[PDB]
RNA sequence: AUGAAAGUGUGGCCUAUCGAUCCUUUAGUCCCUCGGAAUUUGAGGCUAGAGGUGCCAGAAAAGUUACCACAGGGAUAACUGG
RNA sequence: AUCCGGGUUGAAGACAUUGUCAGGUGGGGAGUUUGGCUGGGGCGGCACAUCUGUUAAACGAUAACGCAGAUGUCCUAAGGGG
RNA sequence: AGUGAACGUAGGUUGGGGCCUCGCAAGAGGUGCACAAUCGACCGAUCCUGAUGUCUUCGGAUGGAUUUGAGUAAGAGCAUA
RNA sequence: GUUUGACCUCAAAUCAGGUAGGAGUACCCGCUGAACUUAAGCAUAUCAAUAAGCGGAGGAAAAGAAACCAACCGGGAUUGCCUUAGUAACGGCGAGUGAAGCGGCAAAAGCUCAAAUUUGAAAUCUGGUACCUUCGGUGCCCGAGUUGUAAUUUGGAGAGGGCAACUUUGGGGCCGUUCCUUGUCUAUGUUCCUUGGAACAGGACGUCAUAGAGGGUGAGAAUCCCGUGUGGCGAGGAGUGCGGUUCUUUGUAAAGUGCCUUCGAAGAGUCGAGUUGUUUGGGAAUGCAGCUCUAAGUGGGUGGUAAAUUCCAUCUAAAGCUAAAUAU
């Protein structure tokens, strides 16, 4: 029951898998259901977009932090900055996240102008005055796209000092590896004996 | 503050790191002025538990190092044994002295 | 190491005298790791040994059936025949 | 046909009981195992890991429960040099 | 933890189809892809070597090794049947 | 020792009004629980945290708005798919098993109590009775309840006190349109000949077509019939999605917002620890459970190698509600 010369495979089919195989024939049938579901929700939510204004937010995990992305909800700091209430924001179509806090000025300013640009573009209907017929723009998130901020230029001058960026990284790694051992070799032989010595 | 390179101590990108507002969740266990008054009075009435008497007995007999060694088997942790033996030292001070 | 030296010597003059993984233990090394960041125990790793499998490429293992059973076998006994 | 206490009466008593954990005993019970080769299996044996000579037919290879034997050690000298 | 692929015409050598040159042709000469053997060079590992330096124990330049790798050396792969 | 009345706990009734079982079970929430089998044997492992067994729901269920992930320039309830990945991890480290974070997408929506002195007024609720405009409303009357029913507060906050200016609100009736349940109407050859029992077949000449889907009719029918296509005209429900639309009118009462000042309660046989069993990929122990112990208030959990000392980061447990994307 072993190969001629073949890669050793791990096929996880020793349970009753045949009893819980899920084939997606329903793909096309679900696709028209989701489109009908969107069309009916847009008829219900008559003049308003299907999605709420999301904030911009820098992705976690250093692998991915190089790119920004539409987060969940703005913040109590950004809402107060833009000049509205965290209650009023939720009702007039802005996701507000009670959790997230602002430690970054470029993200803060980006999202604060994103609230100001949304407020500029929407026209909120009065409660009981009159209903002005404004044909519905469906996707708010498509109206306000997530711009990946270009953080540099095309070409520049070589403002060089010649410090060997490899040698810079290698010394920075050494400073990390011997931060504690040098604090111990400074607590003894340097001090704790000088503390008694004249 | 971070350096600006993807290895080392503070590592990496330098942005405007300033600044959040303080969360009201972060002062979860704040003495306050109710719980101070209620915990002070409920200890008046009454009864430091049988192990709390045994720890007081061991503090005045064999110091700490035995108070804690026994307290940490009686309680769960070492961090709790420490704080227990410390509150026992304080009630010993507040009662026995003067 | 020996010998004046040429040289000879990586165990027994030569042909036998022996043992994987996992586990444990030892030797090595200013070594690496314990992933939020430090130190010392502790544990884990890296390179070479040892504790052993005699069924010796290495399961962890006593009978009985005349109460018996199933898959087989003329590859194989109890009768003939050759 | 006495008053009072409303403790029905009498044993036993912080032992026992029960709960949890720990040691022993536990074929009453459960699960499972109970080598291989082989002039049938079994009883013998080891032809199962190795070594010498012969079988072996003058290169090498070569079987049988073929033949006559051997190994699981011994040695800081029985190693090395002179 | 890490580190990370050009001394040279991306190397030399023996082969090597095809193409170029001289020729009537036989042939000789040149250039030689793939592929084959081989000697090197480059990267990581292991064993050392241990410069300028310096948080005086960090840094590891420089050059070697019958050692080692499923490596580099003008990419072959991905998707489907 | 009596008089009468309370209170507390426990009863009774064929007491006024009510509710539970059982069925079904594809999917869902739990409990309990194998062996065959795989390992070329077999006891751990595996099958499998499956079948069987039992308790319990709904159109979905469960989950869910952090005692989360992370270590980033940080993300931000829940579920599902693609991916991570047959990976990190587990394992007689054999057979075999085996997640999670980030990332793209589907759908998106948030919230509620406990702990506060209403204390210049239990403001609250069931019930009974009467009347009405009856999924209810109001008056009066018994009761519940201070051993705490309402208003206010939920950590993002927020409360009390101080000063200063604004800014926004409720109810129903009536059709249209909305979603379902249906009804009805809405073109075209039965012309000629030939075989045949029958023409719905062949040949000829047309017709309609947003209708040549389908079926029926004595053989293959767009044109014979029903329907099909296209629009129309009805009637009956569920109505708050909106439009028109008219009575009011809440209100003297509620909500958001700024600066100052004092405060700022936040869940216990729990958390956690030891140990036993089980379970997990979770490895000096991932969850769960029994038993012993049993905290704290700058506190507690977590930070995937046990501890001690030192910092840091991140949440806020032991109370609770919540559609859609998913299963069938």
UniProtKB/Swiss-Prot annotation, chain A:
What is the annotated role of this protein in its UniProt record? Component of the ribosome, a large ribonucleoprotein complex responsible for the synthesis of proteins in the cell. The small ribosomal subunit (SSU) binds messenger RNAs (mRNAs) and translates the encoded message by selecting cognate aminoacyl-transfer RNA (tRNA) molecules. The large subunit (LSU) contains the ribosomal catalytic site termed the peptidyl transferase center (PTC), which catalyzes the formation of peptide bonds, thereby polymerizing the amino acids delivered by tRNAs into a polypeptide chain.
Alphabetized InterPro entries for the sequence: Ribosomal_eL13 (IPR001380), Ribosomal_eL13_CS (IPR018256)
Q: Name one GO cellular component term.
A: cytosol
The family note in this entry says: Belongs to the eukaryotic ribosomal protein eL13 family.
Which top-rank group of organisms is this from? Eukaryota
Q: Where in the cell is it found?
A: Cytoplasm
Cell membrane as a keyword? no
The record's annotation in PANTHER family points to: 60S RIBOSOMAL PROTEIN L13, LARGE RIBOSOMAL SUBUNIT PROTEIN EL13
According to its UniProt entry, this protein's organism is Saccharomyces cerevisiae (strain ATCC 204508 / S288c) (Baker's yeast)
GO biological process: one example:
cytoplasmic translation
Keyword annotations: Cytoplasm, Phosphoprotein, Ribonucleoprotein, Ribosomal protein
Per the record, the major location class is: cytoplasm
Q: What is this protein called?
A: Large ribosomal subunit protein eL13A
- What else does UniProt say about it? Present with 133000 molecules/cell in log phase SD medium. There are 2 genes for eL13 in yeast.
Describe the subunit structure: Component of the large ribosomal subunit (LSU). Mature yeast ribosomes consist of a small (40S) and a large (60S) subunit. The 40S small subunit contains 1 molecule of ribosomal RNA (18S rRNA) and 33 different proteins (encoded by 57 genes). The large 60S subunit contains 3 rRNA molecules (25S, 5.8S and 5S rRNA) and 46 different proteins (encoded by 81 genes).
One molecular function GO term is:
RNA binding
From Swiss-Prot, chain B:
Keyword annotations: Acetylation, Cytoplasm, Ribonucleoprotein, Ribosomal protein
Q: Which Gene Ontology molecular-function terms are recorded?
A: RNA binding; structural constituent of ribosome
Q: Where in the cell is it found?
A: Cytoplasm
Signal peptide residues are none
Q: InterPro entries this protein is in?
A: Ribosomal_eL36 (IPR000509), Ribosomal_eL36_sf (IPR038097)
Supply one GO CC term from the record. Answer: cytosolic large ribosomal subunit
Pfam family name, one: Ribosomal_L36e
Q: What else is known?
A: Present with 31600 molecules/cell in log phase SD medium.
The molecule here is called Large ribosomal subunit protein eL36A
